[PDB]
């Protein structure tokens, strides 16, 4: 492969590594705290709040939508209400999934950082392979990792 293209690929990989390093540095000071988990919870709760606000507005319109000629509008509002309710139920499901299976914020953050370190090492290995033009080795490593990881939680409906 052309040396210019390989150099550009290496530059892109090092830029991704530098992005990861900046993210880790920003997380260094206090981002290890629950403030980031709290921020994600707050964003999900804001989505839930928007759904609830739309549902309440639709309910208010339906209560105030007293009229024969507007029955089609009432049906449309009912359909929108149904969609909003389904969205609320799904959001509640997701939030409960967050609250149940992530009891240890510290351990989860530690594992995320370890995965980040593993991925940075993998990126450097890819950069070294590209500089050595050993694309076959990189493909073999990706295949091996894909074969290794395989499954989780799929076991639930698998047992069903």
């Amino acid at each position: 492969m052309n040396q210019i293209d390989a150099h550009k690929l290496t530059i892109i990989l090092r830029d991704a590594t530098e992005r990861l390093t900046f993210l880790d540095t920003i997380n260094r000071q206090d981002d290890l705290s629950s403030e980031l988990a709290g921020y994600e919870i707050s964003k999900l709760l804001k989505k839930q709040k928007n759904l609830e606000n739309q549902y309440a507005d639709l309910v208010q319109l339906r209560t105030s939508l007293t009229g024969i000629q507007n029955k089609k509008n009432l049906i449309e509002t009912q359909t929108k209400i149904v969609d909003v309710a389904q969205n609320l139920k799904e959001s509640t499901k997701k939030l409960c999934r967050l609250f149940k299976e992530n009891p240890d914020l510290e351990s989860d953050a530690l594992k995320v950082k370890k995965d980040r370190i593993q991925f940075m090492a993998v990126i450097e290995q890819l950069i070294q392979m590209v500089q050595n033009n050993s694309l076959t080795k990189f493909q073999s490593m990706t295949t091996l990792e894909l074969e290794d990881q395989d499954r989780l939680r799929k076991l639930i409906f698998r047992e069903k």
Partner: protein, 193 residues
């Protein structure tokens, strides 16, 4: 069905950014860029596609072509500097480093602009249709790494140990049930015989 953490979500964002940059690079090979050095005299590139490109995109293409043309002699020197070449000229090394840094800056600018202009990447794909099979393999490996790392970071550390502690029991029971179904199938075959 697996939620993601803030750090894992940032990792995923960088994953998509890297995938997009790789895809853009797929259609930004060296030959096509060098083909942009002289628009009028280099007729291998159709006029219509060049016109359809944005002014900023065309400027970046010309600048990248110029930088690559200048740095072509020095790419080998940079590659071999890691070797025993102690007698390399100091001025030559400084010029090569400056050319490399300018080329990196220009390529980053072009990638940023392309990610911000869908028409730009569409036109870039239009000009070049032959994609290196190694490039496709690298893109697929990038996606595989992305998916595996989403899988990893979509799992709680407690669930991570679950894969070893409780998911051990889950997978062992899955194997037990699969083998029980195998035994029942064997019984069915024998009974039919």
């Amino acid at each position: 069905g697996k939620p993601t953490i803030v750090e894992a979500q940032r990792i995923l964002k960088i994953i998509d950014n890297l995938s997009t940059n790789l895809t853009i690079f797929i259609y930004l090979d060296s030959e096509l860029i060098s083909k942009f050095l002289d628009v009028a005299k280099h007729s291998k590139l159709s006029k219509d596609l060049v016109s359809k490109l944005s002014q900023r995109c065309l400027d970046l293409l010309k600048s990248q072509a110029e930088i690559e043309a200048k740095f072509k002699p020095y790419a080998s020197l940079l590659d071999q500097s890691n070797k025993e070449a102690e007698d390399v000229e100091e001025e030559k090394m400084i010029d090569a480093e400056r050319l490399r840094m300018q080329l990196e800056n220009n390529f980053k600018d072009l990638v940023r602009h392309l990610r911000n202009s869908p028409e730009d990447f569409e036109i870039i794909k239009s000009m070049k249709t032959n994609v290196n099979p190694d490039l496709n393999d690298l893109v697929h490996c990038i996606h595989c790494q992305k998916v595996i790392m989403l899988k990893k970071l979509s799992t709680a550390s407690e669930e991570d140990e679950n894969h070893k502690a409780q998911l051990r029991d889950l997978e062992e029971k899955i194997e037990e049930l699969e083998k029980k179904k195998n035994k029942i199938q064997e019984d069915l075959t024998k009974l039919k015989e």
